[PDB]
Design an enzyme around this catalytic site. Structure first.
Site, PDB file in Angstrom:
ATOM      1  N   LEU A   1       4.125  94.380 -58.337  1.00 41.03           N
ATOM      2  CA  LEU A   1       4.878  95.577 -58.699  1.00 41.03           C
ATOM      3  C   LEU A   1       6.381  95.241 -58.828  1.00 41.03           C
ATOM      4  CD1 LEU A   1       3.222  98.092 -56.140  1.00 41.03           C
ATOM      5  CD2 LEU A   1       2.582  97.748 -58.585  1.00 41.03           C
ATOM      6  N   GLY A   2       6.718  94.023 -59.209  1.00 39.07           N
ATOM      7  CA  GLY A   2       8.124  93.700 -59.390  1.00 39.07           C
ATOM      8  C   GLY A   2       8.873  93.318 -58.134  1.00 39.07           C
ATOM      9  N   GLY A   3      10.202  93.419 -58.206  1.00 37.39           N
ATOM     10  CA  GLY A   3      11.070  92.969 -57.131  1.00 37.39           C
ATOM     11  C   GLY A   3      11.760  94.098 -56.405  1.00 37.39           C
TER      12      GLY A   3
ATOM     13  N   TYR B   1      15.796  92.664 -52.635  1.00 40.82           N
ATOM     14  CA  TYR B   1      15.218  91.373 -52.225  1.00 40.82           C
ATOM     15  C   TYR B   1      13.703  91.516 -52.057  1.00 40.82           C
ATOM     16  CZ  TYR B   1      16.171  93.544 -47.700  1.00 40.82           C
ATOM     17  OH  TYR B   1      16.317  94.401 -46.645  1.00 40.82           O
TER      18      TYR B   1
ATOM     19  N   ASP C   1      22.205 102.840 -52.745  1.00 45.21           N
ATOM     20  CA  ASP C   1      21.601 102.263 -53.951  1.00 45.21           C
ATOM     21  C   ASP C   1      20.725 103.266 -54.728  1.00 45.21           C
ATOM     22  OD1 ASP C   1      21.382 100.156 -55.845  1.00 45.21           O
ATOM     23  OD2 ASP C   1      19.663  99.232 -54.777  1.00 45.21           O
TER      24      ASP C   1
ATOM     25  N   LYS D   1       5.767  94.831 -49.297  1.00 42.71           N
ATOM     26  CA  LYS D   1       6.956  94.129 -49.757  1.00 42.71           C
ATOM     27  C   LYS D   1       7.036  92.812 -48.963  1.00 42.71           C
ATOM     28  CE  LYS D   1      11.941  94.954 -49.460  1.00 42.71           C
ATOM     29  NZ  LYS D   1      12.827  96.157 -49.492  1.00 42.71           N
TER      30      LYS D   1
ATOM     31  N   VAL E   1       7.180  93.044 -54.384  1.00 42.27           N
ATOM     32  CA  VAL E   1       6.304  94.121 -53.921  1.00 42.27           C
ATOM     33  C   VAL E   1       4.945  94.004 -54.586  1.00 42.27           C
ATOM     34  CG1 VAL E   1       6.103  96.633 -53.556  1.00 42.27           C
ATOM     35  CG2 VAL E   1       8.362  95.583 -53.574  1.00 42.27           C
TER      36      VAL E   1
HETATM   37  C1  LIG Z   1      11.840 100.404 -55.120  1.00 44.99           C
HETATM   38  C2  LIG Z   1      11.567  99.053 -55.659  1.00 44.99           C
HETATM   39  C3  LIG Z   1      10.619  98.202 -54.801  1.00 44.99           C
HETATM   40  N1  LIG Z   1      10.819  98.397 -53.357  1.00 44.99           N
HETATM   41  C4  LIG Z   1      11.827  97.807 -52.646  1.00 44.99           C
HETATM   42  N2  LIG Z   1      11.794  98.155 -51.388  1.00 44.99           N
HETATM   43  N3  LIG Z   1      10.689  98.960 -51.198  1.00 44.99           N
HETATM   44  C5  LIG Z   1      10.129  99.139 -52.372  1.00 44.99           C
HETATM   45  C6  LIG Z   1       8.932  99.976 -52.573  1.00 44.99           C
HETATM   46  C7  LIG Z   1       8.426 100.699 -51.492  1.00 44.99           C
HETATM   47  C8  LIG Z   1       7.284 101.461 -51.683  1.00 44.99           C
HETATM   48  C9  LIG Z   1       6.645 101.458 -52.913  1.00 44.99           C
HETATM   49  C10 LIG Z   1       7.233 100.703 -53.946  1.00 44.99           C
HETATM   50  N4  LIG Z   1       6.716 100.630 -55.261  1.00 44.99           N
HETATM   51  C11 LIG Z   1       7.532 100.042 -56.335  1.00 44.99           C
HETATM   52  C12 LIG Z   1       6.661 100.229 -57.544  1.00 44.99           C
HETATM   53  C13 LIG Z   1       5.504 100.911 -57.193  1.00 44.99           C
HETATM   54  C14 LIG Z   1       4.508 101.123 -58.142  1.00 44.99           C
HETATM   55  C15 LIG Z   1       4.709 100.670 -59.459  1.00 44.99           C
HETATM   56  N5  LIG Z   1       3.772 100.868 -60.429  1.00 44.99           N
HETATM   57  C16 LIG Z   1       2.506 101.505 -60.113  1.00 44.99           C
HETATM   58  C17 LIG Z   1       4.010 100.428 -61.797  1.00 44.99           C
HETATM   59  N6  LIG Z   1       5.841 100.045 -59.820  1.00 44.99           N
HETATM   60  C18 LIG Z   1       6.794  99.839 -58.889  1.00 44.99           C
HETATM   61  C19 LIG Z   1       8.064  99.168 -59.344  1.00 44.99           C
HETATM   62  N7  LIG Z   1       7.988  98.587 -60.713  1.00 44.99           N
HETATM   63  C20 LIG Z   1       9.244  97.911 -61.125  1.00 44.99           C
HETATM   64  C21 LIG Z   1       5.537 101.205 -55.742  1.00 44.99           C
HETATM   65  O1  LIG Z   1       4.694 101.750 -55.055  1.00 44.99           O
HETATM   66  N8  LIG Z   1       8.344  99.965 -53.776  1.00 44.99           N
END
Ligand code: A1A1C
Ligand code: A1A1C
Lengths: 288, 289
Positions: free
Chosen positions: B19-21, B24, B133, B42, B27
């Site tokens: 799910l990207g970065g 830091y 942020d 993460k 995920v």
């Molecule tokens: C906020 C950025 C990451 N992060 C940095 N610290 N805590 C997190 C964090 C924390 C909880 C959930 C998530 N995420 C991120 C994400 C998700 C799903 C998804 N889908 C289904 C396409 N795409 C992305 C992001 N795509 C670029 C998801 O559940 N992230």
């Protein structure tokens, strides 16, 4: 540093004695093997894995200062993971080294030191430099009785830190202007040096800065309390109204109201016609 | 930390998708082997000699938040020089992920997101926490169209930095009170998040924040100049007077005059009826079709 000497200074100098530390590195008294000239060599451990930013900024500050009240700079050496900053040797050491032997300075001697430090600060501030570590230990006296500001280690650490942090403070496009301001300017300005000078004047008169025996962390907290009162000289009757007024104005709590180095140079205390090097040469006479 | 799991998180979860970065780490979407529940994990590289203070501060921020509009925290694992932080999964990703497909959000969609972010900010600020942020990339959307703030990485870094810097700032006895103040307090406060929300509202409306084409270092300089005018929406006629006002007040230049998150919750743009997750379910249907 573009002008670094890629050679060991020990090929050209004999290390005579240790002159202590400072913010970082070790300082040595050194004698030129042929000329016999004396210098101060500040040695700092380097490494290919170590960030050169702080030392680069320190050398830049020293090299671009050409003023009688800033320690002279002679060049820097780099050999076998050791960096050596070559500067002017100051035969009488720091004012702290001096007062630990002579006792408290007279009002005239403090007035002369203050004038000389203010001349150095006015120059630094005009070059957009901040010393940020003014105290008796960083005010050096040479054999000629000249007052020289030294140890730009804190100034170099601050500047390097401000530049290094930028990559990691987050994205500017969504950032509030006040956050961008602290990122670029640090949250304070050059007037912090004027306050440090007022504290130094108390130190020269009293042999300790105010709150010297208080834990350094508690001092930070006490200073940030809303009721914090600027320090004052302890022995009121010993000092002139001009000296008390100098302390009052340099220790102005609000930095918006605190006078600049150039403004302070016109203050009655430091603008006395009779202030001259003879006051310090007398101090060095007592030292012997 | 006595709450950390000293075990491989793959004992408990199957890793399903990258799910990207973020500020830091990396995920991953994951599935609980016992319950079938989805979570986000993460993963952050954590060497034995590395400073733990940032990650300690991030987990402390997360673990003491109990508000619908902040991603839930489930726990953390330390295994083989990797720290895994387990959080709520948000099925539609961030608003940035979404608008890169759908295009600009409608004013009602923006209004609902702003209300939801303001609720989470009012909670954070009530705990003396600062996000620092806020941007589309950090506002997550679940399959129900609900909104959660995420990524306390910058917040954790600032907090770790303040405590770490302290030892090296120099002797305090000769220090000016303003130097001591910035060393202990930072130089700014929680109202920075209100400004970031206003920029975010423009981002959702225009697909990028103001000055996005400008070099980031140049943007820092421009904002520090006396005379920096707060940005505005580009297309005046497309937006209501309420939306232009919301932007004007969140982007108040002086932090002494900028309204709080609680104050902003009474603004007519975010207190209007008909603001609910169905607005974002419409946006998700556009993403699918
Ligand atoms: C906020 C950025 C990451 N992060 C940095 N610290 N805590 C997190 C964090 C924390 C909880 C959930 C998530 N995420 C991120 C994400 C998700 C799903 C998804 N889908 C289904 C396409 N795409 C992305 C992001 N795509 C670029 C998801 O559940 N992230
Ligand atoms: C802030 C001083 C260290 N420093 C940190 N960065 N640059 C320097 C620096 C620069 C130039 C000279 C010198 N010094 C220091 C010193 C001297 C002499 C001396 N004598 C004769 C007793 N004592 C001391 C110091 N005693 C504790 C001298 O020439 N130092």
């Amino acid at each position: 540093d573009p002008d670094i000497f890629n050679r060991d200074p020990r090929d050209h100098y004999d290390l005579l004695q240790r002159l202590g530390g400072g913010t970082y590195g070790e300082v040595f008294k050194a004698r030129d093997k042929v000329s016999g000239d004396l210098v101060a060599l500040k040695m700092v451990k380097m490494e290919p894995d170590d960030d050169v930013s702080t030392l680069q900024k320190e050398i830049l500050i020293l090299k671009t200062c050409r003023h009688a009240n800033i320690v002279a700079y002679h060049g820097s050496y780099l050999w076998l993971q050791k960096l050596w900053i070559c500067m002017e040797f100051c035969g009488a050491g720091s004012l702290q080294d001096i007062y630990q032997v002579t006792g408290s300075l007279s009002e005239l001697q403090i007035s002369y030191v203050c004038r000389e430090v203010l001349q150095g600060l006015a120059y630094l501030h005009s070059q957009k430099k901040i010393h940020r570590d003014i105290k008796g230990a960083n005010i050096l006296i040479n054999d000629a009785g000249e007052v020289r500001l030294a140890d730009f280690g804190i100034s170099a650490q601050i500047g390097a830190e401000l530049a290094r942090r930028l990559e990691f403070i987050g994205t500017p496009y969504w950032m509030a202007p006040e956050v961008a301001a602290v990122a670029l300017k640090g949250g304070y300005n050059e007037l912090c040096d004027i306050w440090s000078l007022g504290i130094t004047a108390i130190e020269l008169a009293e042999l300790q800065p105010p709150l010297f025996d208080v834990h350094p962390l508690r001092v930070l907290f006490l200073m940030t309390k809303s009721g914090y009162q600027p320090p004052r000289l302890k022995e009121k009757g010993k000092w002139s109204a001009a000296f008390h007024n100098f302390i009052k104005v340099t220790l102005t709590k609000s930095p918006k109201k605190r006078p600049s180095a150039t403004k302070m140079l016109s203050h009655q205390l430091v603008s006395q016609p009779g202030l001259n090097r003879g006051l310090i040469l007398d101090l060095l006479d007592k030292l012997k």
